[PDB]
């Protein structure tokens with residue numbers, strides 16, 4: 474398979490993916506294919522390798538309906554998706570140099586050596602100097618959470634792209650009332666005693682209609698070169 | 701169906717193999733350049749990325765100039781190996797807060813002329829307390845501050861970042877996403893350079909591309925049963 478053919482195959486998948494408004498309600502993604510989609514999320518990169526996310530697969534019909542009542546952007550997708558995913562981000566209290574989540578992730582998952590960890594997590598060490606001085610994430614809980622949320626959008630993109638590469642449609646979803654969705658998930662136990670908060674949603678399934686032609690700004694509008 | 705099962709599994713494997721191949725590459729081969737065709741393909745993956753309300757609130761700046769790369773390196777603790785050696789270095793900019801409201805020219809022209817949104821739909825989208833405002837203000841609280849609106853834009857840019865990295869890896873090209881820079885100092889450099897276009901853009905995140913010179917340590921992630929929960 475020539476490398477030019479491979480590139481065309483990949484662009485074809487980027488063209489195939491679209492913001493699918495409704496899915497076939499009688500065609501379910503296989504367990505294997507869906508596990509593959511989740512793995513694309515799991516393997517995604519994240520800042521400082523902290524993987525500050527959780528993927529909640531909402532198949533429960535009552536919870537889908539509770540969400541649909543407060544998600545203006547998901548009216549066709551929530552009832553019809555084969556699989557529906559809440560991308561949660563770790564909350565601000567989970568992400569600082571003295572949070573237990575950070576220490577356990579770096580030590581037990583990333584296998585960071587003890588000396589490297591101490592320089593990473595010391596006062597005015599690598600993590601704090603970056604979070605505070607460089608990126609100003611101590612300015613509020615929201616600033617820290619929105620940075621977490623950016624990391625979840627990498628996982629979002631990779632899940633939709635993986636799906637599209639094997640012919641499965643998706644729709645990313647922000648069209649929901651944050652306060653009401655937060656309250657629903659908090660009351661349901663889904664946010665795990667304030668460890669998580671909702672970032673973004675994603676539906677997956679098979680299209681029912683062909684979409685309108687894709688539109689984007691031109692490459693020469695959006696790319697600048699500094700030579 | 702056995703033979704079909706193996707072909708489907710092998711295609712999935714190819715994709716997983718690219719996800720395993722991609723890693724946060726710390727330095728690149730200073731002599732081996734990505735082809736013009738291959739790099740345009742990487743950019744196209746960025747261009748074809750989805751974005752909230754289809755507003756594509758990004759600009760990609762390819763910084764090949766050695767002097768500017770070095771200015772950025774002086775204030776980018778996370779990019780010490782990547783800036784001097786990368787084949788291609790990309791600044792992902794996001795539109796700033798006043799570009800992104802319902803009656804901003806950027807939004808109006810993007811939805812009318814690129815998205816071709818018909819008149820009745822665009823009216824409902826962009827009127828006072830219409831679809832966009834109700835979402836931006838009431839739902840997501842983006843009117844709260846310039847930073848809230850910019851960070852929402854910046855999230856969209858991370859979609860393009862992820863897709864550029866994955867496209868590159870699928871054709872054997874390494875990359876590294878880069879946040880390790882001082883925002884204030886980088887902002888000022890780009891502002892003086894003219895790259896932020898009279899305040900219409902600000903820096904979101906960086907990305908280096910090229911060919912590895914060393915093999916990475918084994919990739920590590922949390923287990924699937926740690927990060928995935930089912931509500932059935």
Ligand SMILES: Cc1cc2nc3c(=O)[nH]c(=O)nc-3n(C[C@H](O)[C@H](O)[C@H](O)COP(=O)(O)O)c2cc1C
Nearest residue numbers: 518519520521522723724778779877878879880919
């Ligand atoms: C948004 C973002 C910013 C990052 N910033 C940097 C950086 O400035 N320098 C760096 O060497 N690595 C950076 N990383 C790399 C992460 O440390 C790395 O992706 C993570 O530890 C997982 O490792 P892998 O990408 O090798 O699988 C960044 C990653 C992401 C997603």
Ligand SMILES: Cc1cc2nc3c(=O)[nH]c(=O)nc-3n(C[C@H](O)[C@H](O)[C@H](O)COP(=O)(O)O)c2cc1C
Nearest residue numbers: 491492546547645646647648687750751752753754
């Ligand atoms: C983060 C994000 C959130 C989105 N929210 C919604 C939504 O709530 N409902 C919806 O129908 N489409 C939603 N969209 C789809 C966008 O309108 C769509 O991706 C964009 O217009 C480009 O079209 P395409 O994905 O068909 O190429 C969202 C897209 C993204 C990236």
